[PDB]
Design a protein around this ligand. Structure first.
Ligand SMILES: NC(=O)c1ccc[n+]([C@@H]2O[C@H](COP(=O)([O-])OP(=O)(O)OC[C@H]3O[C@@H](n4cnc5c(N)ncnc54)[C@H](O)[C@@H]3O)[C@@H](O)[C@H]2O)c1
Ligand SMILES: NC(=O)c1ccc[n+]([C@@H]2O[C@H](COP(=O)([O-])OP(=O)(O)OC[C@H]3O[C@@H](n4cnc5c(N)ncnc54)[C@H](O)[C@@H]3O)[C@@H](O)[C@H]2O)c1
Lengths: 309, 309
């Protein structure tokens, strides 16, 4: 039974995750090794609570439903039914966390990783009772994107997957079970397939990057938000998809490595928003305005997609 | 100068295209070889006008701004400044249309094709003054998706591309210039890259098709509708995209032909909505309800994406 949740790591994905879980009635205690991170998480947490209000997400009529931050990991994981490990994408650091918490939690406590790219099969080699370790892969922002991937590693018990699937559904979120521990699970595989082709087209001068974005946002993302790919195939006709894919699949980029344009940008220290320049240029003011407007649009669009009138 | 538009072909893409162009102030006369198609287009046209109202799209204070259907192609293309060819995806049929209209229109009339998969370079080999032939690739539904691709063939004059780009902008739509006549232009290349991976994951049992759709609609389409792929790379960090793509690109599907599952479905005459069964199952009632709800959500979401409050 999962009533008490500990979150380890309070960076980008932490505060919204904590807020969203507490809003579902769960008791959440969260920990980070860096005091600066815990402080930043407080402001991130208050904004997230308001966003949950704007999404119309209610506390159920039962459960603790609170969030607390602590600088003591023993305090955080004490009595936890679920520990969500949410530390950097580095297997040595994640293994450190598992070793630390292993002696402090019950052998039937579920340990979930928010990892995007490390196989659950590798992660669970670093904790006792690997059958209760599983991938629980949220998306950014975690209090706004309602879909969570649940991924068994080779040793994960089917019961572990079902329990986390059930937890996610119980608080009104949308779990998807990923049935093989493949690189990138499902979401980021499909995303990186989209990106691989988009980057190739920009790189070889087929289309300017801002026009690529207009094209794909409106022609693809807008449509797919309302109609998923399998449903879209049914709308287009699988006969049509057969006819077109018969020659178009052969012509798509099959790049096996990093695109030259991406190597060029990163070599020049152009990393995107974080450095003020990537594919596009940003001022600090524009960045703030863009972040606010994207969060606002995401919230409004989600309510429509959920059927709200 | 483009004031008078003829549309040849009034199937799925025709009525909404005609309505949207007329709403921009243009005079539109449309033709179809099949009387049954012209009749169906009338009901499709009236619904489209209401959708344009719901989108808050106004007639400008000048221009003819009307739609008329005719069963005489000479009548339709008379005095046309732009003929949009919108007939089946079959180069012999498109060539027939170009031969028919060539003697009936000015040598400076622009002839645009709505083709998805036939190279503009091939199409323009079948009309006089190929420099005024261009791709103008709309998306379904054409009165709702605001983005249109403009594609030069090898012989297309840059002026032709600029004139159609300008026409699209002038009525409040979003043109994107595709700078090479590559298979699938940009939109359907990126879409088919997404689909190739999604189909592969369903086919090899990584995820159930309805869960694939939940995953991709919410994790990818929802996000990309608000934030285009190049902008999204900037948010994630190009350093991160470099690190991840360095191993993940190598693992993506590079399928060169039709997926076995798609061959299986089509062999069994399971084509999707049109036959009542494809990836999913549909009743006639469900189909109608789904079509209405998807159109309603598309309209509401678009207004948010455009910044409406
Ligand atoms: N888009 C995203 O950012 C995103 C989305 C889904 C999943 N993820 C995954 O979630 C995990 C965290 O991602 P993030 O973007 O939130 O990272 P982040 O770098 O923003 O935050 C990581 C946090 O972990 C803390 N930390 C480091 N070592 C620790 C330890 N031993 N104990 C406790 N805390 C420690 C850091 O101080 C930092 O606050 C990664 O595995 C990442 O792949 C990220
Ligand atoms: N999603 C889509 O359906 C979509 C989107 C963008 C572009 N397109 C492209 O637009 C074109 C039309 O697509 P559609 O889906 O509207 O096709 P459709 O089959 O729904 O309609 C084709 C119409 O052309 C008519 N026609 C056939 N021969 C003709 C002739 N000689 N003169 C005049 N009319 C004739 C038919 O009677 C029919 O009404 C195709 O090239 C297609 O690839 C389709």
């Amino acid at each position: 039974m999962i009533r008490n949740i500990a979150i380890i790591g309070l960076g980008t994905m932490g505060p919204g995750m904590a807020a969203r879980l507490a809003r579902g009635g769960l008791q959440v205690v969260a920990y980070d090794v860096a005091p600066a991170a815990i402080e930043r998480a407080r402001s991130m947490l208050s904004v997230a609570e308001t966003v949950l209000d704007a999404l119309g997400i209610a506390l159920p009529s039962a459960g603790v439903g609170t969030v607390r931050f602590t600088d003591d990991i023993g305090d955080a994981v004490s009595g936890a039914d679920l520990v969500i490990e949410n530390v950097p994408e580095n297997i040595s650091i994640k293994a450190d966390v598992y070793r630390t918490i292993d002696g402090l939690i019950g052998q039937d406590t579920i340990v979930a990783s928010d990892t995007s790219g490390i196989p659950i099969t590798k992660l669970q080699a670093h904790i006792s009772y690997p059958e209760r370790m599983v991938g629980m892969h949220w998306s950014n922002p975690p209090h706004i994107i309602p879909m969570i991937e649940v991924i068994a590693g080779e040793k994960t018990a089917p019961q572990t997957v079902a329990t986390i699937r059930d937890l996610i559904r119980s608080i009104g979120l949308l779990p998807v079970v990923v049935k093989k521990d493949v690189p990138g699970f499902v979401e980021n595989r499909v995303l990186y397939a989209l990106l691989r082709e988009a980057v190739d087209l920009v790189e070889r001068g087929v289309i300017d990057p801002e026009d690529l974005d207009t094209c794909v946002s409106w022609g693809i993302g807008y449509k797919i938000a309302v109609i998923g790919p399998m449903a879209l195939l049914d709308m287009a006709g699988l006969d049509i998809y057969k006819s077109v894919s018969s020659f178009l699949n052969a012509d798509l980029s099959n790049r096996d490595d990093v695109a030259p344009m991406v190597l060029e940008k990163t070599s020049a220290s152009k990393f995107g928003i974080k450095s003020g320049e990537g594919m596009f240029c940003y001022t600090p003011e524009q960045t703030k305005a863009l972040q606010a407007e994207r969060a606002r649009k995401l919230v409004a669009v989600r309510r429509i997609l959920e059927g709200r009138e």
